[PDB]
Ligand binder design. Structure first.
Ligand SMILES: O=P(O)(O)OC[C@H]1O[C@@H](O)[C@H](O)[C@@H](O)[C@@H]1O
Length: 484
């Protein structure tokens, strides 16, 4: 019921010369075009301070456009580049925006446009958002068209900084025009979660404290922070992926059902469950920093020449959560994220309860695993009678590998899906301001405690190991029952 952007839409990518723009934003715009979801009358404008030409931009991004049909669809590559142009100018001053206002109004007149449709993708750090947002609002805002601006996380590093950014942003652009990106919300398997649970009685009837023993959201990466240790030092793993990506996923797994079809009904339920989270217990935590591999082949986090040697930076964290409402009361929830472990994986693991006594209880807990990445899949640990004369249980792993169906369909990348959604005006996969506020109210006390003077020292774990010491115990302390 929001207006869709199709013909004669102008997409301006601010920060167009940067890494994010050339490796992600423009490649995503192309993928949408290559598969027929970007209208050919779309004007794509890259804006940045440097003084490059239309040729420079096109040749800068060309190495990153994806050709899944190989040398085929090469006309599409050149087709797309021909829709892309460049304008140089400062973010700090009105002359660039007035010059841009002229390029755009020229195009919106050469095509008979009664209602300008303008998307501004801000591929910039927040310290430059507010300037550009001011300038767009002072110079390039039409009360007789519709404009939408995309910004990407982070929006702050704690409650105070996030509040300050939003205080400056709110008088410039409303929630309806703002599209705040957490790119996990564009991943195919993350987008399936709501319909998977709410659309299937076989899961929804069990999705409650009466049947769930343990909820886990799991993030593992096999590499470390080498080279960028000094930057990561003020971030840490909790800020990097847990406060945003992992919290988003958990929110989709625990919210109640949206009662209407408005995208804001999705967002209302996410905010609602966020407010029911109890405060984080600062003791119910497992904090780790990666040391040298047992190998000797891999450096410690501190071996990084850009990291001070007394650094308490957390590169692995497991955190317990509790949600105080009727569905979740007393269910222990764990989010755990680490760099420099043994594999790359993002995964949801839900363990169901067993009855304590009776005939079909000498049997392992049912379990549901949803792999978000790498190999999108759903697995169910099930129980069944042994076929034939035998009257014993055997546990069966049911495979719902999505590779079956995906070799048939076009599965967009996160940014492709997300830009599409913005063009269609659908806020379902974007962060709202109260969502941001509550998520920072939840994590800031933990972050203040860890980074203050009494901040605990992370336990060291070797690069490449499965789990820091204490993890398996931590999980069993949070309702996970291990089995054969
Ligand atoms: O899992 P994805 O889609 O590759 O995203 C993971 C990355 O997400 C970013 O937000 C983090 O800052 C990175 O540290 C992390 O590696």
């Amino acid at each position: 019921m929001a207006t869709q952007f199709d013909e004669n839409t102008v997409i301006t990518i601010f920060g167009a010369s940067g890494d994010l723009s050339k490796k992600k934003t423009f490649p995503a715009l192309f993928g949408l075009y290559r598969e027929g979801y970007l209208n050919p009358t779309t004007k794509i404008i890259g804006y940045a301070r440097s003084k490059l030409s239309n040729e420079d931009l096109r040749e800068k991004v060309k190495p990153f456009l994806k050709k899944p049909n190989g040398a085929k669809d090469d006309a599409k590559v050149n087709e797309f580049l021909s829709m892309v142009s460049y304008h140089a100018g400062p973010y700090d001053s009105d002359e660039g925006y007035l010059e841009l206002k002229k390029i755009i109004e020229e195009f919106e007149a050469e095509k008979k446009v009664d209602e300008p449709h303008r998307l501004f993708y801000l591929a910039l750090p927040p310290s430059i958002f507010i300037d550009v947002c001011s300038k767009l609002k002072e110079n390039l805002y039409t009360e007789s068209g519709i404009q939408r601006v995309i910004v990407e996380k982070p929006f702050g590093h704690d409650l105070q900084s996030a509040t300050e950014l939003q205080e400056k942003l709110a008088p410039l652009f409303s929630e309806d025009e703002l599209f705040r990106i957490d790119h996990y919300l564009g991943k195919e398997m993350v987008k399936n979660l709501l319909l998977m649970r709410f659309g299937n009685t076989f899961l929804n009837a069990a999705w409650n404290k009466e049947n769930i023993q343990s909820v886990q959201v799991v993030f593992k990466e096999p590499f470390g922070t080498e080279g960028r240790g000094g930057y990561f030092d003020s971030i840490g793993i909790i800020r990097d992926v847990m406060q945003n990506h992992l919290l988003q996923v958990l929110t989709l797994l625990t919210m109640e059902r949206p009662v209407s079809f408005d995208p804001e009904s999705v967002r209302d339920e996410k905010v609602k469950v966020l407010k029911a989270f109890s405060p984080i217990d600062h003791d119910d935590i497992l904090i780790g920093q990666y040391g040298r591999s047992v190998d000797g082949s891999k450096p410690s986090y501190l071996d990084d020449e850009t990291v001070k040697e007394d650094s308490k930076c957390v590169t692995f964290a497991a955190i317990g959560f509790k949600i105080a409402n009727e569905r979740w009361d007393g269910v222990p929830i764990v989010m755990r994220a680490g760099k420099a472990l043994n594999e790359g994986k993002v995964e949801i693991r839900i363990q169901f309860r067993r009855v304590a006594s009776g005939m079909f209880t000498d049997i392992p807990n049912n379990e549901l695993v949803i792999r978000i990445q790498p190999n999108e899949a759903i697995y169910l640990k099930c129980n069944a009678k042994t076929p034939g004369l035998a009257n014993e249980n055997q546990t069966t792993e049911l495979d719902l590998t999505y590779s079956e169906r995906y070799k048939n369909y076009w599965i967009p990348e996160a940014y492709e899906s997300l830009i599409r959604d913005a063009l269609l005006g659908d806020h379902s996969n974007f962060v709202r301001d109260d969502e941001l506020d509550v998520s920072w109210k939840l994590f800031t006390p933990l972050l203040n405690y860890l980074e203050g003077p009494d901040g605990p020292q992370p336990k060291i774990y070797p690069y490449g190991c499965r789990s820091p010491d204490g993890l398996v115990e931590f999980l069993a302390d949070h309702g996970y029952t291990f089995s054969k």
